Amino acid sequence: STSNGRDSQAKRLGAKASDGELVSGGSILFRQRGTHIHPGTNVGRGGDDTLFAKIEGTVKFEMKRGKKHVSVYPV
Amino acid sequence: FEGGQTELFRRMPKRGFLNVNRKEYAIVNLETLNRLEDGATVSAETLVA
Amino acid sequence: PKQKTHRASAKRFKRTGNGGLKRFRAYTSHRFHGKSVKQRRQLRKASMVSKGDFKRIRRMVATM
RNA sequence: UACUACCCUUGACUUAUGGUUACUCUAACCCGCUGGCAUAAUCGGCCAGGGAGACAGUGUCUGACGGACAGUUUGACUGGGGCGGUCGCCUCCUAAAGAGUAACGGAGGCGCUCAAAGGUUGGCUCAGAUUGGUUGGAAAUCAAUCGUAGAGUGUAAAGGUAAAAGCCAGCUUGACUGCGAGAGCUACAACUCGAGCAGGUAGGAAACUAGGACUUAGUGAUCCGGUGGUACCGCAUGGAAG
RNA sequence: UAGCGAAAUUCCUUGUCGGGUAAGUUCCGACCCGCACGAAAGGCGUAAUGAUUUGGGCACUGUCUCAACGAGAGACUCGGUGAAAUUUUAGUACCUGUGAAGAUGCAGGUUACCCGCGACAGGACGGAAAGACCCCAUGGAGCUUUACUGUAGUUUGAUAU
RNA sequence: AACUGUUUAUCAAAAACACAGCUCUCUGCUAAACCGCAAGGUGAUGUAUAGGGGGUGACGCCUGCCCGGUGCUGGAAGGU
RNA sequence: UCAAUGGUAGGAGAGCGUUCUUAACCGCAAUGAAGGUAUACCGUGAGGAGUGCUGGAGCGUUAAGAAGUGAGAAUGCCGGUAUGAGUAGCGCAAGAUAAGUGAGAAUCUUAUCCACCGUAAGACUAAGGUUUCCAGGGGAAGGCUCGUCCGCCCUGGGUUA
RNA sequence: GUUCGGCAGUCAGACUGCGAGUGCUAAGAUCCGUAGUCGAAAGGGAAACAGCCCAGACCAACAGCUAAGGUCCCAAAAUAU
RNA sequence: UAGCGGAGAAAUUCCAAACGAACUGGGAGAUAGCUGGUUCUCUCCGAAAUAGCUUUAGGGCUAGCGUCGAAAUGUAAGUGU
RNA sequence: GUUCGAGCCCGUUAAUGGGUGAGAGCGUGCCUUUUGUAGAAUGAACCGGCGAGUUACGUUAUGAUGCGAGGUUAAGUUGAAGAGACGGAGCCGUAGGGAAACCGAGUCUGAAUAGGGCGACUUAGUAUCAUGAUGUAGACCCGAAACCUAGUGACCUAUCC
RNA sequence: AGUAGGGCUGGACACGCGAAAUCCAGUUUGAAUCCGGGAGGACCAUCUCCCAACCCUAAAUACUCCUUAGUGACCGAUAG
RNA sequence: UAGCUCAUGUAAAGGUAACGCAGAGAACUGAAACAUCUAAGUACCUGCAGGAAGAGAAAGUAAAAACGAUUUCGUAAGUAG
């Protein structure tokens, strides 16, 4: 044998919009079981510890704190 | 046929028993009263006549 | 002669006029320990049938 | 506590009696028993005895074993097939810089705990190195110095991790109810969240936070039978049954 | 346990030794390390008996050194008589390659007057045999069992008789 | 392997079967056993030296151990 | 004018041809219907008619409807014909000559020799066969060849308790 | 392009590179992603060639030009510079 | 002495040119995720050979992949650069 | 095999005629399956005939027609197996929400009159026909080994008398 | 009148023992009887209906070997 | 009395096209296998009958005023179950 038919079911990790889009209030931003990016205004961290929006508007990235971030700038 | 798997409907819960004393009234619009004027004593005789 | 309606399938389903069918929820009968608190908060109700699936309606659930 | 006692616990015996075991009888039944009748005729029937006997056998249920004989069952992969192993779910590589993922490819696992390791408030920073000090050890302890985490994070691994998710105290039972816009993921079933609102709450002075745990294993479809509630139906009618 | 042991049993391995044998894995006799002998699933013996199985020898010998001869029947020449299997049709060569990965028929190249007739077998993956080997089918049969369900049958008890 | 016999005609005659023999076990009679729903009948006008089943296969020697388990038998205290 | 037109399983559209259609429409037909045959026409196709000939009764039109409805191919089937092939075989034993017979004799008949069997390859008798026996006549097939011969064929008799 | 409605079949492919994995970094070997090709696409080239390269065919045609590839003869173009 | 059977010096042996289950008729045109077969003409468009599940792996069920029709053309989405 | 064609022969659905054809170029039969068959993968001797996607009833889709919130007669009766006419019993649509009580253009869910859910907003069907697909009918056919019932069979052979 | 019923075992009724009606079997037990008795899908009351446990009943329906009168968008000698 | 004898009565045995009724009664299938179901109480087999048979006069249905033996067809409608 191998003891290696033991399997992992991969799943979708990464981005959803990532670029200034008019993403819906309470909509998904970036799947994270582990935070590379870090939150901001109009943005919630999930029970799935992702980033989810709260209010529509542009969702550009910011280098706050010497670190990677997402808020939502309105309009 | 789910390929030998149980089907969509075969996974359904058993929901709601049924009244044997279920009875309704063959409901019409008031738009037929717009048809007939006045038809004094609007009844089943006015309905099926 | 006629095409026999499956009466127990009719006991599975309930469809609407000018619209789809109401499908009650899975998982909701047998154990409730490992299903979550939120799944208890939300899985009493249930959503509709599919769109690209369920076309095996025809015509096993006829005219009920 | 003598009259009449409406009387009560153990015994005893008349009676009602009943399963009640054993024995006896014989009218039942039986006797591939006797002998006779027609039948000339060993089958049968009848007569007349003997033997047995309320059994036997027969019916209907019930228990026993039961291949004597049937009816079906005995997976899937696979480097032919077979053996072995594996068949679920989570984690990393293989994944090709979105995802997507191939093989009986690698590596691990999990098939849990925790009324507090959960919430909240309020504080704290580790491991390790070196010095020096009675028991002394490589570390027990201590103090000092250095010390971005070279620790820890309940539980493997991954990511994350100091405004701490790390560590310790108090409150603490939000690991609330009813939801849920909006989303994501995608055969479906599922699954991942979730703004915000209401009903009140719980901390916290207030603000603020709170729908489990640092996130991710810790879990399975419908039936069927329970458990409780139930303004529901309750088969003419009420109830009840269900 | 007795008793037999390279067994119709040891692939363990041409076990060992000795005999038969010049030449001797087989044969016999002992040894016996018995994978895995073996006692009523009889074990060890056992004359006569065997269409037995082997091993040796004698005898006789065309089996063979290494063949040859003649007799008859077909064959074959003709007269009469006259079928079967068989198949896309084909005036159907060779080499070397190529290609569902082995050429008659294809590419290149070679030799070949045309048609026969008697014998022969290398092909034509020759026929005849929808492989009886293997595999698969939610295929079926048959068989077995302390599979599961049963059945009769067997044996309790009730109870009318 | 005792023998003679028998053995797959459309393959195989044998060491296979059988066989006397030997062993055990079951059956007291309207047998046991068996066939048939039963009836009826076999067993056999049989009576334990007979009938049925199991083993082994003359003769010679011999058949050792172990009742833990299974089955069988028998017993009933209790459980069921 | 521009653009398009490889195309399998796939899907859409359209058309041809056969037969029956009471329909009608409307004819042909013995001076020749149908059908066959040759044909050196036309039509994108399927398909269509012209002529020559066979042939001597039904057929065609149009349009529409309705369909057992469009034929290679399956161990397709049935029926016929190849093929091999004038080859195998000619079904376990020896006849021979002369003469007849006829039309035609190897094979029919006679004569005369030979030959074979002879615990049979004799005779007689079960079952069986069901008239095969014999006489006369004939030779469509049968006789495994021929054939005047015959268990073949026609006719007639033939079995007595 | 979406939506809605019918109607499908396809489940098992190869091969060529290119990047992986397994394998003796053996293979016309497997198993991925990626493009093409065939399949289901003739003609030409490479001696025939399903997969490589070029080039996508309605048809006629006694037209020319050209792709790769060729130009001593078969077998056409250069005994070309 | 007749097939759920028989016979059997027993091999799975035979039961009428012949048997691990006889032969004849009916059920019943049993069934068959497996083999083969499919017939007139044209035009247009034009595949897949994959994911997920599956007593499933040579088969199905969706989804991806065609075709036609209809409703508008998320007011362009599509597809390039 | 084409295509060209020396040469020959003949003269036609009168036609840029036909029958040839030396020679020369280039040319792997047809079917199912497959990833790929030219095949040494099948299968086909040939020729002719037959020989396979229907209908019964039902649903869905698409059109055609008719009328339209009104469409619709079934069975049956009449009658020529006519037609027409009768026959409205019933059936479809004409609001749903919720399991249901029930409510109703709203309804359910929920303390909600919060949200969500389905709802008129969200705008016509009915009936017949026709076509495709459907489903019960062997249901596109050809196909086993099979299963059971009923019956026949001991002259082969085995047993027995 | 062993009649209804009741027990058990069945079966049919759409009814696969089920809440199971209701009917009919085996087996067992066994009524009331006109103030009666039965049904109304377990069952208890009120109401509705009926009178079993006795027997006969045309008609409308099923199918043709048959007798003709016949009819065919049946079929033409592999057909029928 | 059994039993025996005689006489009388086709009675009645039997042949049967199909339909019926009643008893006895499977399997194959299908359920993707299959033990429940189905197939169907159908295949078969036996008996009893006629021109038809059964069939039948509420110890019925139903649920409100509701009728008044049956039978066949349509419906309800695959509706209730």
Side-chain angles (χ1 to χ4, degrees), chain B residues 2 7 9 11 19 21 27 29-30 33 36-38 40:
Chain B
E2 201 68 27
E7 194 63 31
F9 78 101
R11 292 190 303 278
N19 284 328
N21 51 0
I27 303 164
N29 294 111
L30 185 59
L33 276 306
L36 289 180
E37 292 290 322
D38 55 356

Side-chain angles (χ1 to χ4, degrees), chain A residues 1-16 24-28 31-36 38 45-50 52-56 65 67:
Chain A
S1 294
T2 64
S3 174
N4 294 314
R6 296 286 190 264
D7 193 2
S8 68
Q9 289 178 351
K11 58 186 66 63
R12 280 79 181 175
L13 268 302
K16 299 298 180 294
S24 175
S27 181
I28 305 300
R31 290 295 184 96
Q32 283 182 353
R33 273 159 56 183
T35 168
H36 288 286
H38 297 282
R45 62 182 297 168
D48 48 358
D49 286 337
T50 65
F52 66 94
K54 294 170 73 74
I55 287 95
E56 291 83 3
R65 301 296 299 153
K67 197 168 176 66

Side-chain angles (χ1 to χ4, degrees), chain C residues 8 43 51 54 62 64:
Chain C
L43 292 181
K51 67 96 178 177
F54 97 100
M64 192 66 205

Side-chain angles (χ1 to χ4, degrees), chain A residues 30-74:
Chain A
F30 199 95
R31 290 295 184 96
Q32 283 182 353
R33 273 159 56 183
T35 168
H36 288 286
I37 315 171
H38 297 282
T41 66
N42 303 321
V43 175
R45 62 182 297 168
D48 48 358
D49 286 337
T50 65
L51 288 180
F52 66 94
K54 294 170 73 74
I55 287 95
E56 291 83 3
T58 63
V59 66
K60 69 182 289 184
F61 292 179
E62 290 296 324
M63 297 299 289
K64 304 185 289 184
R65 301 296 299 153
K67 197 168 176 66
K68 184 64 74 72
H69 301 276
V70 170
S71 70
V72 174
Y73 286 165

Side-chain angles (χ1 to χ4, degrees), chain C residues 16 19-25 46-51 54:
Chain C
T16 73
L21 194 148
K22 194 262 173 294
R23 182 261 184 201
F24 287 106
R25 184 56 68 194
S47 70
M48 295 184 288
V49 80
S50 68
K51 67 96 178 177
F54 97 100

